[PDB]
Amino acid sequence: DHLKQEGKFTYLEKGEGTPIVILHGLMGGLSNFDGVIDYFPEKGYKVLIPELPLYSMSLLKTSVGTFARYLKEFVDFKGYENVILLGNSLGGHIALLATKMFPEIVQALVITGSSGLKEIVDEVYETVSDRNKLVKTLAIAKSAIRHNMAKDLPKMKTPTCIIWGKNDNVTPPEVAEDFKRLLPDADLYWIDKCGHAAMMEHPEEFNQLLHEWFKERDF
């Protein structure tokens, strides 16, 4: 597991087999996914965690659509014909939009505590006093909600795994079942006593749930 910087792309890379591209949210450090980074590369998977240009994208090309196209540019750069997308919070929304815009590049979609329907405190105050980053955060939120997925979901054919905390406060469990309803080919699994970051709160069960879903479908 080492950090790569090739061109404008900064990303973590570990593993060799089937590529899993991970999209974290705004809160996201990469410590969110240590569970995934330790488990799946030893199970024959390639884990890639690219750093999206959330707050760097010009004064104003900052939209969910831009991040999705950035993801596409990353996969194309890597030369993959298809990947597995794993997304959390805003990252899940980026992944969803990417699967909508470029379905032929996505083998499967894994979603957990995503939008589209402790000491982190010190990096949300960053948003409210950074001065020029608040606008970008506001730009993202405006772009995100304007870009609702509810209408696009009914036939995003790609196989989708939805893993959710049974007591999520940010994105309530109702949202998870909405995803299950609209998506034509999706499976829903819950994790009890778990909030918005199943990956981090329970990397144990998340890995096992996700791994078994992969086994059933050959992913």
PDB file of C-alpha atoms in Angstrom:
ATOM      1  CA  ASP A   1       0.000   0.000   0.000  1.00  0.00           C
ATOM      2  CA  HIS A   2       1.637   3.207  -1.193  1.00  0.00           C
ATOM      3  CA  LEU A   3       0.560   6.656  -2.370  1.00  0.00           C
ATOM      4  CA  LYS A   4       0.832   7.437  -6.071  1.00  0.00           C
ATOM      5  CA  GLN A   5       1.057  10.786  -7.812  1.00  0.00           C
ATOM      6  CA  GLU A   6       0.997  10.493 -11.584  1.00  0.00           C
ATOM      7  CA  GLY A   7       0.175  13.684 -13.449  1.00  0.00           C
ATOM      8  CA  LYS A   8      -2.728  15.486 -11.798  1.00  0.00           C
ATOM      9  CA  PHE A   9      -3.938  12.243 -10.215  1.00  0.00           C
ATOM     10  CA  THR A  10      -3.164  11.523  -6.565  1.00  0.00           C
ATOM     11  CA  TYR A  11      -4.384   8.138  -5.325  1.00  0.00           C
ATOM     12  CA  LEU A  12      -3.763   5.174  -3.035  1.00  0.00           C
ATOM     13  CA  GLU A  13      -3.098   1.834  -4.705  1.00  0.00           C
ATOM     14  CA  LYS A  14      -2.972  -1.663  -3.227  1.00  0.00           C
ATOM     15  CA  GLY A  15      -3.675  -5.077  -4.717  1.00  0.00           C
ATOM     16  CA  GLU A  16      -3.359  -6.569  -8.184  1.00  0.00           C
ATOM     17  CA  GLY A  17      -6.567  -8.232  -9.379  1.00  0.00           C
ATOM     18  CA  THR A  18      -9.990  -6.772 -10.156  1.00  0.00           C
ATOM     19  CA  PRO A  19      -9.947  -2.975  -9.705  1.00  0.00           C
ATOM     20  CA  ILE A  20     -12.109  -1.422  -6.994  1.00  0.00           C
ATOM     21  CA  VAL A  21     -12.300   2.367  -7.247  1.00  0.00           C
ATOM     22  CA  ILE A  22     -13.291   4.055  -3.991  1.00  0.00           C
ATOM     23  CA  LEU A  23     -14.972   7.460  -3.762  1.00  0.00           C
ATOM     24  CA  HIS A  24     -14.942   9.052  -0.309  1.00  0.00           C
ATOM     25  CA  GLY A  25     -17.004  12.079   0.715  1.00  0.00           C
ATOM     26  CA  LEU A  26     -16.135  15.569   1.947  1.00  0.00           C
ATOM     27  CA  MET A  27     -15.533  14.504   5.556  1.00  0.00           C
ATOM     28  CA  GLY A  28     -13.360  11.739   4.170  1.00  0.00           C
ATOM     29  CA  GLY A  29      -9.807  11.183   5.165  1.00  0.00           C
ATOM     30  CA  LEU A  30      -8.505   7.939   3.688  1.00  0.00           C
ATOM     31  CA  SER A  31      -8.555   6.392   7.147  1.00  0.00           C
ATOM     32  CA  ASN A  32     -12.226   5.733   6.387  1.00  0.00           C
ATOM     33  CA  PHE A  33     -11.304   2.762   4.245  1.00  0.00           C
ATOM     34  CA  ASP A  34      -8.401   1.066   6.057  1.00  0.00           C
ATOM     35  CA  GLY A  35     -10.705  -1.928   6.459  1.00  0.00           C
ATOM     36  CA  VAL A  36     -11.243  -2.253   2.714  1.00  0.00           C
ATOM     37  CA  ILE A  37      -7.582  -1.509   1.929  1.00  0.00           C
ATOM     38  CA  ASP A  38      -6.463  -4.343   4.225  1.00  0.00           C
ATOM     39  CA  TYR A  39      -9.029  -6.980   3.272  1.00  0.00           C
ATOM     40  CA  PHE A  40      -9.723  -7.020  -0.474  1.00  0.00           C
ATOM     41  CA  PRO A  41      -6.244  -6.701  -1.997  1.00  0.00           C
ATOM     42  CA  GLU A  42      -5.381 -10.003  -0.303  1.00  0.00           C
ATOM     43  CA  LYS A  43      -8.554 -11.492  -1.776  1.00  0.00           C
ATOM     44  CA  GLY A  44      -7.560 -10.840  -5.385  1.00  0.00           C
ATOM     45  CA  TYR A  45      -8.747  -7.254  -5.793  1.00  0.00           C
ATOM     46  CA  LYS A  46      -7.112  -3.966  -6.757  1.00  0.00           C
ATOM     47  CA  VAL A  47      -8.104  -1.124  -4.435  1.00  0.00           C
ATOM     48  CA  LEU A  48      -7.760   2.413  -5.794  1.00  0.00           C
ATOM     49  CA  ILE A  49      -8.649   5.532  -3.819  1.00  0.00           C
ATOM     50  CA  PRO A  50      -8.372   8.673  -5.990  1.00  0.00           C
ATOM     51  CA  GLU A  51      -8.481  12.154  -4.478  1.00  0.00           C
ATOM     52  CA  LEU A  52     -11.215  14.105  -6.221  1.00  0.00           C
ATOM     53  CA  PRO A  53     -10.748  17.852  -6.857  1.00  0.00           C
ATOM     54  CA  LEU A  54     -13.621  18.846  -4.549  1.00  0.00           C
ATOM     55  CA  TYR A  55     -12.193  22.253  -3.628  1.00  0.00           C
ATOM     56  CA  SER A  56      -9.711  22.895  -6.431  1.00  0.00           C
ATOM     57  CA  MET A  57     -11.915  22.967  -9.508  1.00  0.00           C
ATOM     58  CA  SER A  58     -11.572  26.479 -10.646  1.00  0.00           C
ATOM     59  CA  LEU A  59     -13.594  29.125  -9.035  1.00  0.00           C
ATOM     60  CA  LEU A  60     -16.680  27.553 -10.555  1.00  0.00           C
ATOM     61  CA  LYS A  61     -16.756  24.277 -12.442  1.00  0.00           C
ATOM     62  CA  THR A  62     -17.447  22.697  -9.073  1.00  0.00           C
ATOM     63  CA  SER A  63     -20.333  20.296  -9.612  1.00  0.00           C
ATOM     64  CA  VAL A  64     -21.213  16.638  -9.073  1.00  0.00           C
ATOM     65  CA  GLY A  65     -21.109  16.235 -12.850  1.00  0.00           C
ATOM     66  CA  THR A  66     -17.524  17.493 -12.933  1.00  0.00           C
ATOM     67  CA  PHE A  67     -16.402  15.052 -10.239  1.00  0.00           C
ATOM     68  CA  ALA A  68     -18.085  12.208 -12.128  1.00  0.00           C
ATOM     69  CA  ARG A  69     -16.249  13.130 -15.331  1.00  0.00           C
ATOM     70  CA  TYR A  70     -13.041  13.379 -13.301  1.00  0.00           C
ATOM     71  CA  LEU A  71     -13.627   9.811 -12.135  1.00  0.00           C
ATOM     72  CA  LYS A  72     -14.177   8.763 -15.747  1.00  0.00           C
ATOM     73  CA  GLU A  73     -10.926  10.482 -16.706  1.00  0.00           C
ATOM     74  CA  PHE A  74      -9.176   8.555 -13.923  1.00  0.00           C
ATOM     75  CA  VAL A  75     -10.463   5.144 -15.019  1.00  0.00           C
ATOM     76  CA  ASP A  76      -9.667   5.926 -18.660  1.00  0.00           C
ATOM     77  CA  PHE A  77      -6.181   7.031 -17.614  1.00  0.00           C
ATOM     78  CA  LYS A  78      -5.764   3.711 -15.819  1.00  0.00           C
ATOM     79  CA  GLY A  79      -6.903   1.974 -19.001  1.00  0.00           C
ATOM     80  CA  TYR A  80      -9.635  -0.113 -17.388  1.00  0.00           C
ATOM     81  CA  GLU A  81     -12.496  -1.348 -19.562  1.00  0.00           C
ATOM     82  CA  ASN A  82     -14.591  -1.752 -16.421  1.00  0.00           C
ATOM     83  CA  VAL A  83     -14.252  -1.173 -12.675  1.00  0.00           C
ATOM     84  CA  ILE A  84     -16.119  -1.659  -9.416  1.00  0.00           C
ATOM     85  CA  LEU A  85     -17.288   1.604  -7.845  1.00  0.00           C
ATOM     86  CA  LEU A  86     -17.549   1.925  -4.069  1.00  0.00           C
ATOM     87  CA  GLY A  87     -18.975   5.176  -2.737  1.00  0.00           C
ATOM     88  CA  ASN A  88     -19.814   6.810   0.586  1.00  0.00           C
ATOM     89  CA  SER A  89     -21.658  10.057   1.368  1.00  0.00           C
ATOM     90  CA  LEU A  90     -21.008  12.468  -1.498  1.00  0.00           C
ATOM     91  CA  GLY A  91     -18.718   9.834  -3.010  1.00  0.00           C
ATOM     92  CA  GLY A  92     -21.664   7.499  -3.462  1.00  0.00           C
ATOM     93  CA  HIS A  93     -23.492  10.269  -5.301  1.00  0.00           C
ATOM     94  CA  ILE A  94     -20.483  10.771  -7.582  1.00  0.00           C
ATOM     95  CA  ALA A  95     -20.372   7.019  -8.174  1.00  0.00           C
ATOM     96  CA  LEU A  96     -24.101   6.911  -8.939  1.00  0.00           C
ATOM     97  CA  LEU A  97     -23.885   9.757 -11.448  1.00  0.00           C
ATOM     98  CA  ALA A  98     -20.835   8.144 -13.044  1.00  0.00           C
ATOM     99  CA  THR A  99     -22.719   4.857 -13.440  1.00  0.00           C
ATOM    100  CA  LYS A 100     -25.563   6.831 -15.019  1.00  0.00           C
ATOM    101  CA  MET A 101     -23.300   8.754 -17.400  1.00  0.00           C
ATOM    102  CA  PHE A 102     -20.859   5.929 -18.146  1.00  0.00           C
ATOM    103  CA  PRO A 103     -22.493   2.532 -17.435  1.00  0.00           C
ATOM    104  CA  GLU A 104     -20.208   0.641 -19.832  1.00  0.00           C
ATOM    105  CA  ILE A 105     -17.235   1.456 -17.602  1.00  0.00           C
ATOM    106  CA  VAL A 106     -18.832   0.171 -14.390  1.00  0.00           C
ATOM    107  CA  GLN A 107     -18.980  -3.564 -13.653  1.00  0.00           C
ATOM    108  CA  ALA A 108     -20.749  -3.102 -10.317  1.00  0.00           C
ATOM    109  CA  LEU A 109     -21.795  -0.327  -7.945  1.00  0.00           C
ATOM    110  CA  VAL A 110     -21.411  -0.511  -4.167  1.00  0.00           C
ATOM    111  CA  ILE A 111     -23.252   2.103  -2.119  1.00  0.00           C
ATOM    112  CA  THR A 112     -23.195   2.840   1.596  1.00  0.00           C
ATOM    113  CA  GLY A 113     -24.499   5.845   3.526  1.00  0.00           C
ATOM    114  CA  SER A 114     -24.578   7.908   0.349  1.00  0.00           C
ATOM    115  CA  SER A 115     -26.444  11.034  -0.715  1.00  0.00           C
ATOM    116  CA  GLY A 116     -28.315  11.554  -3.976  1.00  0.00           C
ATOM    117  CA  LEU A 117     -31.830  11.240  -2.568  1.00  0.00           C
ATOM    118  CA  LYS A 118     -15.144  12.750  16.548  1.00  0.00           C
ATOM    119  CA  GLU A 119     -12.420  15.269  15.641  1.00  0.00           C
ATOM    120  CA  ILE A 120     -13.767  15.891  12.115  1.00  0.00           C
ATOM    121  CA  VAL A 121     -15.257  18.840  13.895  1.00  0.00           C
ATOM    122  CA  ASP A 122     -11.988  20.660  13.196  1.00  0.00           C
ATOM    123  CA  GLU A 123     -12.503  20.107   9.468  1.00  0.00           C
ATOM    124  CA  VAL A 124     -16.057  21.368   9.048  1.00  0.00           C
ATOM    125  CA  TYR A 125     -15.130  24.613  10.775  1.00  0.00           C
ATOM    126  CA  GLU A 126     -12.553  24.659   7.998  1.00  0.00           C
ATOM    127  CA  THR A 127     -15.482  25.174   5.631  1.00  0.00           C
ATOM    128  CA  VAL A 128     -16.953  28.110   7.571  1.00  0.00           C
ATOM    129  CA  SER A 129     -13.793  30.227   7.921  1.00  0.00           C
ATOM    130  CA  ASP A 130     -11.775  29.244   4.913  1.00  0.00           C
ATOM    131  CA  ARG A 131     -13.687  31.995   3.183  1.00  0.00           C
ATOM    132  CA  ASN A 132     -13.240  30.756  -0.361  1.00  0.00           C
ATOM    133  CA  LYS A 133     -14.104  27.091   0.262  1.00  0.00           C
ATOM    134  CA  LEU A 134     -17.521  27.754   1.747  1.00  0.00           C
ATOM    135  CA  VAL A 135     -18.704  28.884  -1.684  1.00  0.00           C
ATOM    136  CA  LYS A 136     -17.376  25.669  -3.211  1.00  0.00           C
ATOM    137  CA  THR A 137     -19.096  23.576  -0.535  1.00  0.00           C
ATOM    138  CA  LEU A 138     -22.280  25.538  -1.210  1.00  0.00           C
ATOM    139  CA  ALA A 139     -21.701  25.038  -4.936  1.00  0.00           C
ATOM    140  CA  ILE A 140     -21.381  21.274  -4.424  1.00  0.00           C
ATOM    141  CA  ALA A 141     -24.511  21.018  -2.272  1.00  0.00           C
ATOM    142  CA  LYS A 142     -26.525  23.099  -4.740  1.00  0.00           C
ATOM    143  CA  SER A 143     -25.238  20.925  -7.586  1.00  0.00           C
ATOM    144  CA  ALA A 144     -25.902  17.738  -5.611  1.00  0.00           C
ATOM    145  CA  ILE A 145     -29.543  18.384  -4.695  1.00  0.00           C
ATOM    146  CA  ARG A 146     -30.297  19.844  -8.130  1.00  0.00           C
ATOM    147  CA  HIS A 147     -28.950  16.554  -9.443  1.00  0.00           C
ATOM    148  CA  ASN A 148     -31.471  14.192  -7.842  1.00  0.00           C
ATOM    149  CA  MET A 149     -31.046  10.512  -8.716  1.00  0.00           C
ATOM    150  CA  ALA A 150     -34.629   9.382  -8.013  1.00  0.00           C
ATOM    151  CA  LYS A 151     -35.693   9.828 -11.643  1.00  0.00           C
ATOM    152  CA  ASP A 152     -32.588   8.178 -13.121  1.00  0.00           C
ATOM    153  CA  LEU A 153     -32.521   5.122 -10.841  1.00  0.00           C
ATOM    154  CA  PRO A 154     -35.517   3.101 -12.248  1.00  0.00           C
ATOM    155  CA  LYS A 155     -33.265   1.559 -14.906  1.00  0.00           C
ATOM    156  CA  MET A 156     -29.616   1.976 -14.075  1.00  0.00           C
ATOM    157  CA  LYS A 157     -29.127  -1.681 -14.983  1.00  0.00           C
ATOM    158  CA  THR A 158     -25.755  -2.147 -13.278  1.00  0.00           C
ATOM    159  CA  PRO A 159     -25.649  -4.671 -10.391  1.00  0.00           C
ATOM    160  CA  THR A 160     -25.759  -2.666  -7.168  1.00  0.00           C
ATOM    161  CA  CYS A 161     -24.853  -3.604  -3.604  1.00  0.00           C
ATOM    162  CA  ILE A 162     -26.375  -1.422  -0.900  1.00  0.00           C
ATOM    163  CA  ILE A 163     -24.880  -1.804   2.576  1.00  0.00           C
ATOM    164  CA  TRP A 164     -26.298   0.421   5.301  1.00  0.00           C
ATOM    165  CA  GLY A 165     -26.116   1.168   9.009  1.00  0.00           C
ATOM    166  CA  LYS A 166     -29.436   0.276  10.628  1.00  0.00           C
ATOM    167  CA  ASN A 167     -29.429   3.545  12.585  1.00  0.00           C
ATOM    168  CA  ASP A 168     -27.968   6.098  10.167  1.00  0.00           C
ATOM    169  CA  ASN A 169     -28.693   9.715  11.119  1.00  0.00           C
ATOM    170  CA  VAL A 170     -27.166  11.619   8.196  1.00  0.00           C
ATOM    171  CA  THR A 171     -28.689   9.416   5.503  1.00  0.00           C
ATOM    172  CA  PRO A 172     -31.553   7.573   7.295  1.00  0.00           C
ATOM    173  CA  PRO A 173     -32.328   3.893   6.487  1.00  0.00           C
ATOM    174  CA  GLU A 174     -35.387   5.095   4.549  1.00  0.00           C
ATOM    175  CA  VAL A 175     -33.028   6.358   1.843  1.00  0.00           C
ATOM    176  CA  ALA A 176     -31.460   2.901   1.555  1.00  0.00           C
ATOM    177  CA  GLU A 177     -34.825   1.277   0.858  1.00  0.00           C
ATOM    178  CA  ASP A 178     -35.641   4.033  -1.636  1.00  0.00           C
ATOM    179  CA  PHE A 179     -32.478   2.998  -3.482  1.00  0.00           C
ATOM    180  CA  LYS A 180     -33.576  -0.635  -3.318  1.00  0.00           C
ATOM    181  CA  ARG A 181     -37.043   0.282  -4.623  1.00  0.00           C
ATOM    182  CA  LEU A 182     -36.029   2.282  -7.683  1.00  0.00           C
ATOM    183  CA  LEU A 183     -32.891   0.409  -8.784  1.00  0.00           C
ATOM    184  CA  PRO A 184     -33.822  -2.560 -11.024  1.00  0.00           C
ATOM    185  CA  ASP A 185     -30.904  -4.799 -10.022  1.00  0.00           C
ATOM    186  CA  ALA A 186     -29.869  -4.069  -6.436  1.00  0.00           C
ATOM    187  CA  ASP A 187     -29.332  -5.950  -3.173  1.00  0.00           C
ATOM    188  CA  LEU A 188     -29.760  -4.433   0.288  1.00  0.00           C
ATOM    189  CA  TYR A 189     -27.857  -5.457   3.425  1.00  0.00           C
ATOM    190  CA  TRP A 190     -27.942  -3.824   6.862  1.00  0.00           C
ATOM    191  CA  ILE A 191     -25.429  -3.446   9.681  1.00  0.00           C
ATOM    192  CA  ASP A 192     -26.939  -3.071  13.155  1.00  0.00           C
ATOM    193  CA  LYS A 193     -25.698  -0.478  15.672  1.00  0.00           C
ATOM    194  CA  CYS A 194     -24.055   1.390  12.829  1.00  0.00           C
ATOM    195  CA  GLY A 195     -24.223   4.984  11.627  1.00  0.00           C
ATOM    196  CA  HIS A 196     -23.112   6.866   8.536  1.00  0.00           C
ATOM    197  CA  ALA A 197     -19.744   5.157   8.033  1.00  0.00           C
ATOM    198  CA  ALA A 198     -20.246   1.378   8.045  1.00  0.00           C
ATOM    199  CA  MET A 199     -16.781   1.055   6.501  1.00  0.00           C
ATOM    200  CA  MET A 200     -15.225   2.637   9.572  1.00  0.00           C
ATOM    201  CA  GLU A 201     -17.636   1.681  12.353  1.00  0.00           C
ATOM    202  CA  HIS A 202     -17.743  -1.966  11.278  1.00  0.00           C
ATOM    203  CA  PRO A 203     -15.031  -2.833   8.730  1.00  0.00           C
ATOM    204  CA  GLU A 204     -15.430  -6.425   9.898  1.00  0.00           C
ATOM    205  CA  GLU A 205     -19.006  -7.032   8.709  1.00  0.00           C
ATOM    206  CA  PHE A 206     -18.803  -4.612   5.793  1.00  0.00           C
ATOM    207  CA  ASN A 207     -15.943  -6.572   4.241  1.00  0.00           C
ATOM    208  CA  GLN A 208     -17.727  -9.882   4.797  1.00  0.00           C
ATOM    209  CA  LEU A 209     -21.053  -8.627   3.420  1.00  0.00           C
ATOM    210  CA  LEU A 210     -19.387  -7.061   0.382  1.00  0.00           C
ATOM    211  CA  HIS A 211     -17.116 -10.051  -0.237  1.00  0.00           C
ATOM    212  CA  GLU A 212     -20.024 -12.501  -0.222  1.00  0.00           C
ATOM    213  CA  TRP A 213     -21.933 -10.304  -2.654  1.00  0.00           C
ATOM    214  CA  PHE A 214     -18.906 -10.424  -4.960  1.00  0.00           C
ATOM    215  CA  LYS A 215     -18.808 -14.225  -4.726  1.00  0.00           C
ATOM    216  CA  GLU A 216     -22.462 -14.606  -5.712  1.00  0.00           C
ATOM    217  CA  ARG A 217     -22.025 -12.564  -8.878  1.00  0.00           C
ATOM    218  CA  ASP A 218     -18.385 -13.194  -9.813  1.00  0.00           C
ATOM    219  CA  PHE A 219     -17.032  -9.678  -9.279  1.00  0.00           C
TER     220      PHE A 219
END
